[PDB]
Amino acid sequence: HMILYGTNPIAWSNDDDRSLGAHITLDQCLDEAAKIGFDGIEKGHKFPQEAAALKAVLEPRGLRYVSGWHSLNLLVNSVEEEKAAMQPALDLLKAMGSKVIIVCETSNAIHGDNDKPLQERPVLEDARWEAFGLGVEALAAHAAAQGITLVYHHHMGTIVETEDEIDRLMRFTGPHTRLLLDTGHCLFGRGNPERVAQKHIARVGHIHAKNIRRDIVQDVRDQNLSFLEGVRRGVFTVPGDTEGSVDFVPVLKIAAEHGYQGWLVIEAEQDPDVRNPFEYQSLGLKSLKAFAREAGLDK
Ligand SMILES: [Co+2]
Ligand SMILES: [Co+2]
Ligand SMILES: [Co+2]
């Protein structure tokens, strides 16, 4: 299949606040992801990191290793220091047959800081954008020569959150650097997911189909809450949730018309005690397959 459907384990156990879903084992997360019908799953903090041990848990379940998140520190480290820091993840992705590496500059990110409101998130100095993009494209070209496509995950609480900052990254990068379009983080950052698709679909190498609850997002803006406070309150949900705001079909229709191939990943951090991972991820996969069908992306 050219279009593959994945999930992300943070719907079961959160990476940034490990108390969320701490009670859910790796076995429960992988068992349920396989039963629901996902073709594969992305890396989470409970995952093994040796290729032989990671195959031992994913192959019996029929799950492919979609990719793994890898933090960048180009704002405080050199490019060479970051090529070294990135190589271990490239070795695992290659050994696992993965074609993509997910990256995001977190040196000064605040999404993992429970005490810091999202409005206090870092903004990259205007002068630094060109050098930062050159460091990103250098890492992208390093990975591409090893057969791995680099996709940058724009994220709340980081220097790349707004739609205009997604444009600036895409202007100061290329050709190997690709965008990971996360529809949840895009709309949360006041961007328009459909408009971002129109501009950058040709450079999109990975897609996260994440929904948002508009009422909860407005609470995070009015009360000036942190990123993780929002997650615990339900800022994110899955495609198909009536409480969501993201219009997925127009995004997938743009991807269909430009011949996108690769993964569509249901990613929805929530409090798993209140938002049962099996129920919401099940609704996400069903709804996202139907949306992709309606958009002409999956036939
Ligand atoms: Co080149
Ligand atoms: Co995140
Ligand atoms: Co994402």
Closest ligand to Cα 152: 3
Angle separating helix axes 248-257 and 193-200, nearest 10 degrees:
10
Between the CA of 148 and the centroid of ligand 1 the distance, in Å, is: 13
Q: Is 299 exposed, middle or buried (0-12, 13-18, 19+ CB in 10 A)?
A: exposed
The rounded Å distance from CA 209 to ligand 3 centre is 8
Please give all residues whose CB falls under 5 A of ion ligand 3, grouped by chain where several chains appear. 182, 208, 267
155 Cα–ligand 2 center, Å: 7
Q: Phi/psi at 180 (nearest 5 deg)?
A: -95, 110
Tokens representing 109? 């990110």
> Residues 33, 34, 38, CA angle at the centre, nearest 5°?
75
Q: What ligand is nearest to the CA atom of residue 44?
A: 2
CA distances for 84 relative to 42, 91, 145, 175, 218, angstroms: 22, 11, 15, 22, 41
Per the CB < 8 A criterion, the answer to whether 118 and 157 are in contact is yes
- Ligand 3 center–CA 208 separation, angstroms: 5
Torsion-angle region of 121 (φ positive above 0: left; ψ -120 to 50: alpha; else: beta)? beta
Separation of CA 180 and ligand 3 centre (Å): 8
Closest of 148, 173, 4, 8 to residue 74, by C-alpha? 173
Beta strands in 192-266, from DSSP E residues, in sequence order: 204-209, 211-212, 236-237, 262-266
Give all domains of the chain, ordered by start, each with its CATH number.
Answer: 3-294 (3.20.20.150)
Give the determination technique: X-ray
Contact 248/239 with Cβ under 8 angstroms? yes
What ligand is nearest to the CA atom of residue 264? 3
Closest ligand (CA of 177): 1
**Most distant CA atoms of the chain, gap in Å:** 50
Report resolution in angstroms.
2.3
Q: Which helix (H) or strand (E) holds 102?
A: strand 100-105
